[PDB]
Amino acid sequence: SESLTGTLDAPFPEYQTLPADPMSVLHNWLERARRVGIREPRALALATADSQGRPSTRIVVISEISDAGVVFSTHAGSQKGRELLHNPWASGVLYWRETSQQIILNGQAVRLPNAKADDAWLKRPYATHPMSSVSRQSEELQDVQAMRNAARQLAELQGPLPRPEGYCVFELRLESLEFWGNGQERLHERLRYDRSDTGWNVRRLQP
Amino acid sequence: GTLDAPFPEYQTLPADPMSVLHNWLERARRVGIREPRALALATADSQGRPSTRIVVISEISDAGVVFSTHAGSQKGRELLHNPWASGVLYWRETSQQIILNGQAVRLPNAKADDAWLKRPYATHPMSSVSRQSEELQDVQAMRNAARQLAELQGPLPRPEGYCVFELRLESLEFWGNGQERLHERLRYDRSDTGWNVRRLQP
Numbered sequence A: 001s002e003s004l005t006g007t008l009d010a011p012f013p014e015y016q017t018l019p020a021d022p023m024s025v026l027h028n029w030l031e032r033a034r035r036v037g038i039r040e041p042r043a044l045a046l047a048t049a050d051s052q053g054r055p056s057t058r059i060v061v062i063s064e065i066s067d068a069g070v071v072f073s074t075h076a077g078s079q080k081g082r083e084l085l086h087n088p089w090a091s092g093v094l095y096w097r098e099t100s101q102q103i104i105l106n107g108q109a110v111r112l113p114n115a116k117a118d119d120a121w122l123k124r125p126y127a128t129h130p131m132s133s134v135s136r137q138s139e140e141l142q143d144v145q146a147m148r149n150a151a152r153q154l155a156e157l158q159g160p161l162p163r164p165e166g167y168c169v170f171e172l173r174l175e176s177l178e179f180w181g182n183g184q185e186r187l188h189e190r191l192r193y194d195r196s197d198t199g200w201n202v203r204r205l206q207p
Numbered sequence B: 001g002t003l004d005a006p007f008p009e010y011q012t013l014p015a016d017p018m019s020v021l022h023n024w025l026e027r028a029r030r031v032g033i034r035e036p037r038a039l040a041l042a043t044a045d046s047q048g049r050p051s052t053r054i055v056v057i058s059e060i061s062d063a064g065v066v067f068s069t070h071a072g073s074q075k076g077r078e079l080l081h082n083p084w085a086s087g088v089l090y091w092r093e094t095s096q097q098i099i100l101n102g103q104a105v106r107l108p109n110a111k112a113d114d115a116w117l118k119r120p121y122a123t124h125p126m127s128s129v130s131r132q133s134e135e136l137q138d139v140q141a142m143r144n145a146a147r148q149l150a151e152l153q154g155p156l157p158r159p160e161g162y163c164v165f166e167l168r169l170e171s172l173e174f175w176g177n178g179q180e181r182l183h184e185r186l187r188y189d190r191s192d193t194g195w196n197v198r199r200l201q202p
């Protein structure tokens, strides 16, 4: 049995019109996702790779769309952080079950300045600050209750804490994108962009 | 996170992560998670640059998980030269992730024949005419060619490039939302004799 469950109309005029500027398509799709109530449309399955080219994956949230790509925050000492600092190339996929749409985002992640990290940190609900402050993301957790107790002590403040060392913001500066829609008669609609010396090259891909 | 999401394994540390995987997937099916087997699968090219896309896990095997694709696709070409891959399952309803890391191996043609025959026959026409991920020069021509094949009573022959991969796991992580933002992370790594297990900081 085919696994697709999407039933919401998902207009894809861009597959016909081939807009020159793919970030407009990204904005169009994300705005529509917000308006129709897609659940967690910005949950990005982000892939990085280690020193030997072995991929790793996890979900991160896209916090902003920038001129050059998409932005997310994480811990520098995490697996993804360590991998990106050595090999900036990454790829992430958005998949929206309700509309049977995928967006694939490929590019190089760049760590943004601390001033930007400071701002992103302050924009998080302060209830998130204690655990993010005590946790060394992705290192082994030796004592669960100890971590719980330490966070609870910091939570007493009931206000913002200093940005932890290692809390950082990456901009994934895009070099290619794909927009995927279910299409008609299983001719899935794949619109592929690749950065060129000036602007972008645009192609349709076979499903 | 709107549905119940028990994670007793975070407390008990079961020795066999494949048991945990089977149990999580069965639970997902029972509670009615939407498309639980939609795997965001990452591969990488010869420069170490990742690429991603969704594929569906067709079966859970002794060594890992299985999916089908076209050998000439981007993921197929990448796996042919670099077998290492990683995939993530994310279930919004229970705020759970499963991360699967290992090496993908192409299975024999008899296995591919069986997988092909198990697909709904209505999928056979487009899968036969399409060279997945190659540039599409003429949309209507592809549509018309598939329409010609759709008139047949299936099944059609398996197209040469239609293949099955087994992702043989070397590590797994089970992630749950936990309490007080202490997200619960259970990480397994293959050893010479079995599996090592640990908890990770959120």
Ligand SMILES: Cc1cc2nc3c(=O)[nH]c(=O)nc-3n(C[C@H](O)[C@H](O)[C@H](O)COP(=O)(O)O)c2cc1C
Residues within 6 Å of the ligand: A043, A056, A057, A058, A059, A060, A061, A062, A072, A073, A074, A075, A078, A079, A080, A081, A137, A138, B095, B096, B097, B175, B202
């Ligand atoms: C819905 C969801 C969103 C998440 N968003 C982020 C995020 O924006 N940044 C982050 O560092 N981790 C986020 N996480 C946790 C990551 O998936 C992951 O566990 C953590 O970043 C460690 O990844 P790593 O060990 O591969 O580096 C999120 C998890 C879920 C379930």
Ligand SMILES: Cc1cc2nc3c(=O)[nH]c(=O)nc-3n(C[C@H](O)[C@H](O)[C@H](O)COP(=O)(O)O)c2cc1C
Residues within 6 Å of the ligand: A003, A004, A095, A100, A101, A102, A180, A207, B038, B051, B052, B053, B054, B055, B056, B057, B067, B068, B069, B070, B073, B074, B075, B076, B132, B133
């Ligand atoms: C929900 C969903 C499930 C999919 N499952 C598969 C699959 O099992 N096998 C496959 O080859 N493509 C599958 N696709 C299409 C892929 O996402 C992708 O477009 C195609 O495999 C080409 O990927 P590539 O160019 O990166 O190799 C699926 C797409 C969606 C939206």
Ligand SMILES: O=C(O)[C@@H]1CC=CC2=Nc3ccccc3N[C@H]21
Residues within 6 Å of the ligand: A001, A002, A003, A004, B056, B068, B069, B070
């Ligand atoms: O659940 C399905 O059939 C998938 C849905 C969308 C696209 C697919 N492409 C495939 C290509 C080759 C083999 C299996 C696929 N699965 C479907």
